[PDB]
Each structure stands twice: as structure tokens, then as C-alpha cells.
């Protein structure tokens, strides 16, 4: 086509989606990770995660308002990844890298798994 | 903070949101523009438009599944802008620029209004 493109559009959309999340506006699911709960938008979760894409395209699970993750999933690891989904920013630290990588593998977030593997290999 | 950032994340999220829209997955509103209907996600509309941000933060309108636009709004103009919302790509042409600009003004999409004004000024 002969379209023009607004460079910052995708980033501005994501910034607004994060603002809606912070104010709990039109959030439609709560992700339970052991004792912790995280409110989010199903569409954003599906757009970032192979696991959530699978869950919310399921004819029964698409209608659930609560999703319980595997008890082995670390809440801090999940929190860091949920923030990444809504911001493109990953708070990767020596103290959390193992939990972040295991959570990214479970959530099926290939690019996060890739940078975790690379940061781990550099430290060995 | 000490975060790392994935450059393509925002664009990949938007590409997936557009894929969900095309397959009518978790769309939660229909925008009626005279004889035409457009299915979309409320969160994406709010993230792109001052008008939709106002509508869906309203305590009554947030729960509506159908929103009827002003009868003066051109469906093709709306279609071009809805595509822009989900892709960052604006199909701006001599034959549609007036309708696109009027629709962008109504929807409160300042950057689109700005490029329309500039393209119009260049042709006078």
C-alpha cells in the first residue's frame, strides 16, 4: 500500500494500556500465583505469551475471570514479566534471573528466555 | 531502574492485537457508523482516541456493547482510522483526506489531525 506510519504509535498504545492496568480500568482477569494476585487485560496477556494465547483461545477458559498458575511459579518472577508485557522493560538482575527464566519458559515468552540464557552463559 | 528493553515488543504486541481483531477474538464492542459496523477491543480504542477514552471510562458507557457514532461520521474514514489504531499505518489519500481529518478530529486523535493539516496545506 501507500500508507504513512506514525513511528511512536505502538509505544504510545502500550503506555496507555499500562496506565489502564495501573488504574484497574477494564481489566478482565486476575492471575493467581500462589498467595499473590495480579489484575490484567486478557488481550495483552495473549499478545505477549504463548501460554495465555492458548488459554484464552480455549472455548471454556476464555470465559474465566480467574486463572491459577502452577504452584512452582514465583510471584516476583511473574510480576517482572507482567511489567515487561506492559512496558517492553525487563528488570533482569542476578537475584531474579533464574526465577524470570523459569517463568518466561512456562509463559512461553521466547525473547525473554533468549536474553536470560545469554546473561547466564556470560556469568559462567 | 537498571532494566533492559526489547525494541520490537510494542510493535509485536500491536501486531497480535490486530490478529485478534481480524479473527474476532475477545472483541467486546461494536462501533456503529451509519449502515456499517466495526468490531474492536475497548482497551485499544481508549489507548488511541480521546473520545473512546472518555466513553469507556464513563461509569455507564463502559458497560455498553454497542456505541453509535454521530451520523456525520464517514464509515470509510472510521475504517481507515480503526486500521491505523491497530497497525500505526494510515492510508491517507487525496480522495479520503477530508473524511479522515474530520473523523480524527471527532475521535480526538491529535497526531492524525496534525498530518492531515500538513498534507492539506502542502496542496494549497
Amino acid at each position: 500500500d501507500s500508507c504513512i506510519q506514525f513511528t511512536r504509535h505502538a509505544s504510545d498504545v502500550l503506555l496507555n494500556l499500562n496506565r489502564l492496568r495501573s488504574r484497574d480500568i477494564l481489566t478482565d482477569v486476575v492471575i493467581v500465583v500462589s498467595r499473590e494476585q495480579f489484575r490484567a487485560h486478557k488481550t495483552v496477556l495473549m499478545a505477549c505469551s504463548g501460554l495465555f494465547y492458548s488459554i484464552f483461545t480455549d472455548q471454556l477458559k476464555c470465559n474465566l475471570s480467574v486463572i491459577n498458575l502452577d504452584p512452582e511459579i514465583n510471584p516476583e518472577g511473574f510480576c517482572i514479566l507482567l511489567d515487561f508485557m506492559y512496558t517492553s522493560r525487563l528488570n533482569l538482575r542476578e537475584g531474579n534471573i533464574m526465577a524470570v527464566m523459569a517463568t518466561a519458559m512456562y509463559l512461553q515468552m521466547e525473547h525473554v528466555v533468549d536474553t536470560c540464557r545469554k546473561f547466564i552463559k556470560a556469568s559462567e | 531502574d537498571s532494566c533492559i528493553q526489547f525494541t520490537r515488543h510494542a510493535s509485536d504486541v500491536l501486531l497480535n492485537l490486530n490478529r485478534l481483531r481480524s479473527r474476532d477474538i475477545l472483541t467486546d464492542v461494536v462501533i456503529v457508523v451509519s449502515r456499517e459496523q466495526f468490531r474492536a477491543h475497548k482497551t485499544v480504542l481508549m489507548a488511541c482516541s480521546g473520545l473512546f477514552y472518555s466513553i469507556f471510562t464513563d461509569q455507564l458507557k463502559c458497560n455498553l456493547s454497542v456505541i453509535n457514532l454521530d451520523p456525520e461520521i464517514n464509515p470509510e474514514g472510521f475504517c481507515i482510522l480503526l486500521d491505523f489504531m491497530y497497525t500505526s499505518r494510515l492510508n491517507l489519500r487525496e480522495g479520503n483526506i477530508m473524511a479522515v481529518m474530520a473523523t480524527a478530529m471527532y475521535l480526538q486523535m491529535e497526531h492524525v489531525v496534525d498530518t492531515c493539516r500538513k498534507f492539506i496545506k502542502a496542496s494549497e
Binding site: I4, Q5, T7 | -
Partner: peptide, 4 residues
């Protein structure tokens, strides 16, 4: 705005 750019030509993509």
C-alpha cells in the same frame, strides 16, 4: 510520520 515516515514512509514505512
Amino acid at each position: 510520520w515516515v514512509i514505512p
